[PDB]
Design a protein around this ligand. Structure first.
Ligand SMILES: COCCCCn1c(C(=O)N(CC(C)C)[C@@H]2CNC[C@H](C(=O)N3CCOCC3)C2)ccc1-c1ccccc1
Ligand SMILES: *[C@@H]1O[C@H](CO)[C@@H](O)[C@H](O)[C@H]1NC(C)=O
Length: 333
């Protein structure tokens, strides 16, 4: 068709980006991460035991208050790199940026405190392909496309650096927003259909890693840039960063002096300065500052792979092109 549509996002502390969707009649509202690294939609269920504290603190979908609910009840387990959610399939009308779709989604009944007690979002809207969808459930974007309303088979992500009288982020469904990028889009083709993943031909500090070529997943649902444990260990040894439990840190004074990190993607060199990857919460030598780069071990067939999360998308406005199986990058502004 001709419609373009946007979802306004909230930026919590540069680590979580999420927007609002409505589910049911009348619409029950949820905060959701829009995630190119997965393909399922889930929100917490009212049938979630309150022994899960995460279900006490998030919005719960109540099927009993929706006149448009359609039962399914097939068990669903979604295993992310950092935690599992479990529950069952349901169908209802999901409203996202003024588009209503009939969507099968997971009602989560099992929701661990880690990491979900630390989540400002309630659930996830997977923006990946049907190939990676658990239960072979049609993803929301595939459903929006079937309706023939959008101007193009594309969606774009803007993640703001600032988090205070400004929008935290934006997703354009059906195009991109020229107000949030500049210069030309650089288009990189995907390795295959089914995964938002591209060939990376080197990771540079100041090339040390990925010299013989590796995979880079473009994961809007992730906070950080992640690599494999051994990839990250060598990167951090080169940065002089100390390994902690869940993050890598430097002494806050050393922060500004940290070298640039480059990702060789599609023939061009995508460079992040220390300002882009260090949480400069201080300049004290008595204080430690977290890096926005950690380890994530992703098993076959998706991994081993690097993941380009919010750290990367903050600098680079990202267009996801389902029609041509490619990703466009442009300088965010
Ligand atoms: C942009 O803002 C998004 C913030 C969400 C980041 N995050 C993840 C997370 O990164 N994910 C899982 C999913 C639930 C949002 C990833 C999303 N993409 C799919 C990833 C995955 O499971 N993979 C990678 C691709 O191959 C399969 C496994 C996991 C886990 C926990 C948190 C979190 C972080 C701070 C506070 C509270 C929670
Ligand atoms: C659940 O959905 C699947 C796929 O659409 C279908 O085969 C099945 O009949 C549904 N089950 C119930 C109990 O509605």
């Amino acid at each position: 068709g001709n419609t373009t549509s946007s979802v306004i996002l909230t930026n919590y502390m540069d680590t979580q980006y999420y927007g609002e969707i409505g589910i049911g009649t009348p619409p029950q509202t949820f905060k959701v991460v829009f995630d190119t690294g997965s393909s399922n939609v889930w929100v917490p269920s009212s049938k979630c035991s309150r022994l899960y504290t995460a279900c006490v603190y998030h919005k719960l979908f109540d099927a009993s208050d929706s006149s448009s609910y359609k039962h399914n009840g097939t068990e669903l387990t979604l295993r992310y790199s950092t935690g599992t959610v479990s529950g069952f399939l349901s169908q209802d009308i999901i409203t996202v940026g003024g588009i209503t779709v009939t969507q099968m989604f997971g009602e989560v009944t099992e929701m661990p405190a880690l990491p979900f007690m630390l989540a400002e979002f309630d659930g996830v809207v997977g923006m990946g392909f049907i190939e990676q969808a658990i239960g072979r459930v049609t993803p929301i974007f595939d459903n929006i496309i079937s309706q023939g309303v959008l101007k193009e088979d594309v969606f774009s992500f803007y993640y703001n650096r600032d988090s205070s009288q400004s929008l935290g982020g934006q997703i354009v469904l059906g195009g991109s927003d020229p107000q949030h990028y500049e210069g030309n889009f650089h288009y990189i083709n995907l390795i295959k259909t089914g995964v938002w993943q591209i060939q990376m031909k080197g990771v540079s500090v100041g090339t040390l890693l990925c010299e013989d070529g590796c995979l880079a997943l473009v994961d809007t649902g992730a906070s950080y840039i992640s690599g494999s444990t051994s990839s990250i260990e060598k990167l951090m040894e080169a940065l002089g960063a100390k390994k902690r439990l869940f993050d890598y840190v430097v002494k806050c004074n050393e922060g500004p002096t940290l070298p640039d990190i480059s990702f060789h993607l599609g023939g061009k060199e995508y460079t992040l300065t220390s300002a882009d990857y260090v949480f400069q919460e201080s300049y004290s030598s008595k204080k430690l500052c977290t890096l926005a780069i950690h380890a994530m071990d992703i098993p076959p067939p998706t991994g081993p792979t690097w993941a380009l999360g919010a750290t990367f998308i903050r600098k680079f406005y990202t267009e996801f092109d389902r029609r041509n199986n490619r990703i466009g990058f442009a300088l965010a502004r």
